[PDB]
Design a protein around this ligand. Sequence first.
Ligand SMILES: CC(C)=CCC/C(C)=C/CC/C(C)=C/CC/C(C)=C/CC/C(C)=C/CC/C(C)=C/CC/C(C)=C/CC/C(C)=C/COP(=O)(O)OP(=O)(O)O
Length: 174
Amino acid sequence: HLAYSLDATASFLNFVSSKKTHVLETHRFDVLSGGISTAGEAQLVIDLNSVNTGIDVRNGRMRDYLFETATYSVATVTVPVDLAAVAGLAVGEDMLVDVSATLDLHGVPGVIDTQLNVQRLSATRIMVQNQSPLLIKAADYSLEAGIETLRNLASLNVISTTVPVDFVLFYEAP
Ligand SMILES: CC(C)=CCC/C(C)=C/CC/C(C)=C/CC/C(C)=C/CC/C(C)=C/CC/C(C)=C/CC/C(C)=C/CC/C(C)=C/COP(=O)(O)OP(=O)(O)O
């Protein structure tokens, strides 16, 4: 039973790599799914096969050697939500929510303690986004070896193991 469903088309989630001397590139996942149950569990499922770095060979290397998508096709975030506090938002009103979100990525579940911005857009639609810049450390999900494979394949000197993540999620009630 769902209180909300993710609007997958309108929603997005991006991450930024840095290589060499602070050479930044923003990548995205083209396919997201999710919803919020009537029991107050929000989920975001990130299709790791939908990684889009703008370069097909690189996408393949990220699927095969970083995320290892034959084993790990999706990353799943789960967050307890107060549905009454969401219901209580007036149209156009926001609130800050301090969450302990569980991220299941690359076989290593971890908790992300962060703050989300939740804004009501209409009687049925809400927008959820990271309130501040959100950094993921590859080592927290056993992803450093994959980064080293990508580095060595590219003949690069350095690839940063810290990755900023940004998202804007739209959820819609029945
Ligand atoms: C109402 C309410 C509150 C609802 C809640 C809604 C909800 C569920 C919200 C979500 C909450 C939260 C906190 C979600 C968490 C989101 C996160 C953090 C998801 C994880 C995203 C993710 C999988 C990110 C990737 C992580 C990592 C570490 C990736 C590593 C990337 C990396 C460094 C890649 C290297 C790429 C490079 C540079 C390759 C070199 O090749 P190339 O560039 O071709 O070389 P050359 O220079 O030769 O050209």
